[PDB]
Amino acid sequence: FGNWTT
Amino acid sequence: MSRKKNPSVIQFEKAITEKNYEAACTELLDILNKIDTNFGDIEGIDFDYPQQLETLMQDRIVYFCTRMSNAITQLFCDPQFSLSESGANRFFVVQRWLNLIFASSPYINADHILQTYNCNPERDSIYDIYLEPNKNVLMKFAVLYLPESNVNLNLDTMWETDKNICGSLCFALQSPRFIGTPAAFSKRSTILQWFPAKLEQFHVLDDLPSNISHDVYMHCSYDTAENKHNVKKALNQVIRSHLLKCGWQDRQITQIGMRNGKPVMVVVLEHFHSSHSIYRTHSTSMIAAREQFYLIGLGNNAVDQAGRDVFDEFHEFDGSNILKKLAFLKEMCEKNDAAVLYMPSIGMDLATIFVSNARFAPIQVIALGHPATTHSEFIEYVIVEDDYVGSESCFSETLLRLPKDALPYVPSSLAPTDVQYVLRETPEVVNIGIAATTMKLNPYFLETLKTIRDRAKVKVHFHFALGQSIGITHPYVARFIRSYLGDDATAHPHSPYNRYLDILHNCDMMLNPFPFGNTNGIIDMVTLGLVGVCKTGPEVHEHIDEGLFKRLGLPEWLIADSVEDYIERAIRLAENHQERLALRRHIIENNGLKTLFSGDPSPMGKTLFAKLTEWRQTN
Ligand SMILES: O=c1ccn([C@@H]2O[C@H](COP(=O)(O)OP(=O)(O)O)[C@@H](O)[C@H]2O)c(=O)[nH]1
């Protein structure tokens, strides 16, 4: 899991 | 046996045959909604297929996209098919997935549908579509005006026809996690210049696709324009307007409560678990903060045990409703009379953007989980390491520049420890790794890799380890890459962490993307003893690369100012086998990974206690 929107 | 009936492509096709348009839209929205929930995976969508595709995933996905594309064509071309405004609002939320049904199919886009809506045989270009004057056709047109559309649209003509359709389509076109192709990236470039002045005119989200608002907010950081974050200011105003209109009152601040010795800092998290980017970067500083402050964590059940454990106490948000979540956060701040509100990430959850547009504590603070300004009145301070900052002018808020070592990083829970370094002495082909999310790919970065391959005196092969390239996203991304680099590149789908390292472990060097660079991606690089080139710029999301390379005793020449500089250095590092091996032996022999995991975590807790004291002086 990295930096992106739900 | 399973929780809930799967969406069926067959159910969808049967509906289109019997001309049951409302069953057909329902089945289609059911299918897109499920894909959206699974970030592009099509597991648990029902469809028959030729047995030759049982064991060939990429070919199964293309079959699915083609069959869906065929069905959507038969439906949206039928002139007897009327689309309600609620139908259109639901489709605008999931246009990103419609885009992929067509873009990952052989058809590329839905322009063949749009051509059926043209009523003017006397038109200058096949790219100009003239619509009958009625709402039905305009919504069918806007829904099927996809990121890869090659059809002309003028936003001024659209704005003057229906503001709500125009606003919705601008939201929908900023919403995809991959907007890297020339057609998509340039639609979005244009939107970011044109739309902020139009979005200010809105008093509510009630008629826009609100559930992709956080996407509009986050995704603008990936354009190249200096003024690219303006849409966030516009959006902050509409969220504020929307919030007040729901009968929201700010907390009237009148008492600083203490629990044990200290004052209370409420922490609101979006993503936080031992293997997530945000815990790796920001957990150490929040642990240490617990010496100055009493720490209340708020989060969803996604946050694991090791994540709950960095707080004195922790509360699950009970559900998805934003008004209830801001009500629960006011109760918490009103009962503990909170002094500080800290969000280490803002922009990945819509709830957290609402929170940054209201008052819960006298000192309200963000870190750079997502490294962009908020353009919010309600945010006083930004936490950031000194060596990560370019211009102070990139940020609407006051910077708290903490010393280089103020946020010691942490390994992922999934990190290996026994890692065999491989330093290929003279490889015939220099394998070049790109550890990037679909968000960070763009025409500028791919022109650049293309030019590097064309000038390099040595054979290069690019290996893209692509976060968020899942299910129906991947064909589209693969062809984007192939269109620049032909057989000299491989597009690896999103993989589990161990597998993602195997892809990079196979490489001789790495290139950091731009304008928006890596962080955790650089920890992944030095975890494997790899070296690579990066670009620097005014934004933090351009400068982190420059910062971390310097924290590793790495040379200035690995850091580029311009694109042309980047190209020379990328070539230099690829051609000079002996030099790159030197740099790799440096990072390995001087335990470079161990230096990123080390430092003084305390400065966040002290600098924020300091600011409360100054504030308390002045009540
Ligand atoms: O195929 C992939 C791609 C990415 N990642 C994870 O995503 C992280 C970083 O993604 P992010 O978007 O946060 O990048 P950053 O800008 O923070 O480097 C990596 O370190 C990996 O843990 C992964 O596990 N598999």
Residue numbers in the entry:
A (entry chain C): 1 to 6
B (entry chain A): 1 to 619
Paper passage:
Soluble HMW1C-like N-glycosyltransferases (NGTs) catalyze the glycosylation of Asn residues in proteins, a process fundamental for bacterial autoaggregation, adhesion and pathogenicity. In contrast, NGTs are two-domain enzymes that consists of an N-terminal all-α domain (AAD) and a C-terminal catalytic domain that adopts a GT-B fold, as shown for Actinobacillus pleuropneumoniae NGT (ApNGT). We focused on AaNGT, an inverting GT that catalyzes the transfer of Glc from UDP-Glc to Asn residues in the consensus sequence Asn-X-Ser/Thr. The heart-shaped structure of AaNGT, either complexed to UDP-Gal/UDP-2F-Glc or UDP-peptide, shows the N-terminal AAD domain and C-terminal GT-B fold catalytic domain, which is composed of an N- and C-Rossman fold subdomains.
A surface representation of the ternary complex reveals that UDP is partly buried and mainly recognized by the C-Rossmann fold subdomain while the peptide is more solvent exposed and tethered mostly by the N-Rossmann fold subdomain and the AAD domain. The UDP pyrophosphate of the ternary complex (AaNGT + UDP + peptide) exhibits more interactions than in the binary complexes, with Thr519, Asn520, and Gly521 backbones, and Ser277, Thr437, Lys440, and Asn520 side chains contributing to this. Additionally, interactions with Arg280 are observed in the ternary complex. Therefore, these more extensive interactions of UDP with the enzyme could explain the higher affinity of UDP compared to the sugar nucleotides. Multiple hydrogen bond interactions are observed at the peptide binding site in the ternary complex (AaNGT-peptide-UDP). The structural data demonstrate that the key residues involved in recognition of the peptide are Arg177, His214, and Asp215 from the AAD domain. In summary, the structural analysis shows that NGT shares two critical and conserved residues among NGTs, Arg177 and Asp215, in the AAD domain that recognize Thr and likely Ser at the +2 position of the Asn0-X+1-Ser/Thr+2 sequence motif. CH-π interactions between the peptide and the protein were also observed, in particular those involving Trp4+1 and the methylene group of Gln468 (AaNGT). The Asn at the acceptor position 0 in the sequence motif (Asn30) is located in front of the UDP pyrophosphate, although its side chain does not participate in interactions with any residue of AaNGT that could potentially serve as a catalytic base. Consequently, our ternary complex does not supply any evidence on how the Asn is glycosylated and thus no insights into the NGT catalytic mechanism could be inferred.
